[PDB]
Ligand binder design. Structure first.
Ligand SMILES: O=C(CO)[C@@H](O)[C@@H](O)[C@H](O)CO
Ligand SMILES: O=C(CO)[C@@H](O)[C@@H](O)[C@H](O)CO
Ligand SMILES: [Mg+2]
Ligand SMILES: [Mg+2]
Ligand SMILES: [Mg+2]
Ligand SMILES: [Mg+2]
Lengths: 283, 284, 286, 285
């Protein structure tokens, strides 16, 4: 039921330790967002009580996201993926999060060199069924983020994400789209939204170069008009890679700055997105 | 009006719907393999309804008709004459096998007071459209209200204004008719016209921003088609270009120079572009 | 002229260029840190040039003027009346410190014969603009010819037509003025107007497709800004949004409903957008 | 001097073997393009005089493209890279090709895990200088194609490619842009064209998902307006991986069909692109 505008906290914190959480919440207040997305690079280390109290005091909602580490890629090590996800689901639920989303079906860097196979998808479906039931037991939902061909060869489009949701058969898994990935993957950016429309509950609003929304190659008018047209009432989450911790950035093929500074990205990008949301009547 | 698929406004071959003109237009429709034609009715009384009916039926073609009111019958100021004009056009549309009368049926090209539209004007329009809608209902057809840009008419320029008139009238057989060329000027983001009209949108003119070749101008086609798909549009996708319009009609529409090279450019590049986009975004 | 940087057509802030309106406009221009304002020259005898000049120099603002000709002086058909009107307008522009007189200086906003333009009309215009260009030269200012859409004028609608008139007149102090709202209607791909006009282009109205807030309509801004960067554009970038409507051109401009909530929404959201695009595409001066 | 429209032959054949050359040249003539772009991925395996005969016979021009294999990535193994490029240059010359372009400076799929270093660019520059001399020896030019961050970590933007061209100092190396790559890397697609304007001689007009141009997220009006604005006069080349050369498949990451078939891409994409070139008055159209 995540609604309104939010921010992926990577711009201030990929390490969700005590000072990092305080720093991200502080930013969230400064930009008057409705929610934050909390990356969980190391779920066991998260202080759930601190974060809960922070979200409650500051009347902020949250969800969490991750991508599977290689020791636990679901396509090939599903039992370890289930174990990794159960820990992340519990931490998410305990800190007050409403969903765990992201690359929860695999990891950044998976690539076999040939098309995804039924054996791989079978393993993913088994992992997501296990994890969805655990999520349900803690009262949260799972999100599946479609990412571009280079990061993962399994779920790149909204239509692929929907197929996996159908193969799993749960009711608490939604699609999570990201405009930067859709800019590469969708045959017309609106088609990712169209194909996912029955399951789309969250979208990363990111520019085509991970810099400043409004200043790249994404078709924002098409994106926003199509979200309004399908009655999108889910989470509008700004994602930019500015000020990413270096080794995490290098993991995402950031070889060079995506933008001048946080003042360019947040000062120009959030108003652009909020303005478009008002323009097309998502508010 | 259940009109569906692709069609063409026949102005590229005929603005005078006489006997050879109707045959010329139907011949074009077959060549480009469209599902329906839009028949301009510049002079409704002169239309041979039986000839056109037979032609549509024999060739498996659907149709609607469209018009703008002449000044002697602008509805905002001369509603009684507007009603009389529309009744004749509605009867001719139904009798030729048409499923709707659409267009600038609420006023005319060239209305302008210099100030915002007034409630008195809208009251006269609503009375005309209510009378016309009743008459259309009795003949089994629907009416369409085409939003046009600020310079052609000062009364209905956006999808949201068109929906407000439909609500003011309260009929069930009036729909909205959008035109990408007018939306390109009037809508605050072109998809917003579709969004605002979504509960009433049954027909759209796919026209380029300069009235030339769709795909080669300033209209935002991906937003247009994505948004049509996203609202589940299943109405008429009608191509409109001003290529080869008769001069007098063209001058009345502010065509001061060619909109395109020739029909081969317009139909040969523009129709495939639009069919391709329709398939791309799943309207097909 | 040498106009560079960002400016605003003063309809953003006032309906007429009277003394209180000039006060209100210059004060608003200062809270946005623009480099110049564009002042309508619709009632030349009514402009208090000493008052305006003092305001401009005090607040270190540059200016130019624009107009459309009234029907009594449409150059198409009443060229001698047009020469006289333009001479008065030029003098007032020069007097108040403005650096150019631009816009629809060749005809009316809302001018239309009902038929395509003729050589007789273009010949009259050329004669008027030659005479007007000599008088501008005598007062130290330039003239601009703005292409406007088919519904506002039937004579010059595209960058290519504007350049053809500039080359027909053969003056050296007349430049082309484009407007993205008009190009959105007239140009077969918006960048083509910029390309066609590139050798004479010194000024552009960055106006949204519905005269509203730039960034929130149907104009193709990335194409516009990339093409302006590519041709080396170095002239004025001016906003034009009819928050207020000068009465003498209201009928031709056809703003029958609000273009935007208010001046704060257009300047607060549109100017940053435009400045940010100019910097994104590396526009000379940024 | 490549002018007009051409097609990268992955449109029609996976490998440039003898039957693939015959099938690609036949299709190229059916669509009346001016040139084809031939992958030079296994130089020893190319039958040059067979291809040369086909090209001359069918009044077709050609250039070659490649990415370097890991054994000869210029950034880490510069001497192997020089040797490999000389072999590829000689074969491109022998078959009548007029340039060797693409990722001639590195691998399709090359990544260290960290940003590029000066040591890497120093090696590439040395490689390209030597390669440029030998290309001149055989009378062809070299092209440097910027590719997106996921295929190479070294040259990703028009401005980076120009910086390497200025560093090497050679007269006969041009910049090669790709709209699919610029869709990801350029901060506004036209900026890649603007940044590379002094050296830009070749452009891949490739849709954002490698499918049919005109049916993705590439900003074609911006692309074509800016090309006209800078006076682009070089080659306009389609690139759609209907067929996937085996040696670069892992790096190009085409895991599902980019389009129905080569008829859909050529039948819809090429007229779209020819029509835009005419619309914006591109020199040669
Ligand atoms: O864009 C236009 C025409 O509609 C304007 O620049 C000029 O008419 C100025 O408003 C001069 O009055
Ligand atoms: O766009 C690209 C790289 O992704 C291609 O031009 C090159 O890889 C050449 O085709 C060489 O294979
Ligand atoms: Mg994301
Ligand atoms: Mg229409
Ligand atoms: Mg203007
Ligand atoms: Mg390429």
């Amino acid at each position: 039921t995540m609604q309104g505008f939010g921010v992926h906290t990577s711009m201030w914190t990929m390490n969700w330790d005590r000072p990092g959480a305080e720093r991200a919440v502080a930013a969230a207040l400064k930009y008057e967002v409705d929610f934050i997305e909390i990356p969980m690079l190391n779920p066991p280390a998260v202080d759930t009580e601190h974060t809960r109290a922070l979200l409650e005091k500051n009347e902020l909602r949250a969800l969490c996201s991750l991508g599977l580490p290689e020791r636990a890629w679901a396509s090939v090590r599903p039992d370890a993926a289930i174990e990794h996800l159960k820990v992340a689901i519990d931490k998410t639920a305990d800190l007050g999060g409403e969903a765990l989303s992201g690359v929860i079906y695999g990891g950044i860097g998976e690539r076999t060199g040939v098309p995804p196979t039924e054996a791989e998808y079978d393993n993913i479906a088994r992992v997501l069924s296990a994890a969805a039931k655990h999520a349900k037991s803690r009262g949260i939902e799972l999100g599946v983020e479609a990412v571009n061909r280079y990061e993962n060869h399994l779920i790149n489009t909204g239509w692929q994400a929907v197929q996996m949701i159908e193969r799993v058969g749960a009711d608490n898994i939604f699609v999570h789209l990201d405009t930067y990935h859709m800019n590469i993957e969708e045959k017309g950016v609106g088609n990712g939204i169209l194909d996912a429309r029955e399951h789309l509950k969250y979208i990363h609003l990111s520019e085509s170069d991970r810099g400043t929304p409004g200043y790249g190659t994404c078709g924002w008018d098409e994106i926003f008009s199509t979200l309004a047209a399908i009655g999108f009432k889910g989470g509008l989450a700004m994602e930019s890679f500015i000020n990413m911790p270096p080794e995490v950035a290098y993991g995402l093929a950031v070889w060079r700055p995506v933008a001048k500074d946080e003042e360019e990205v947040m000062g120009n990008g959030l108003p652009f997105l909020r303005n478009k949301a008002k323009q097309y009547g998502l508010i």
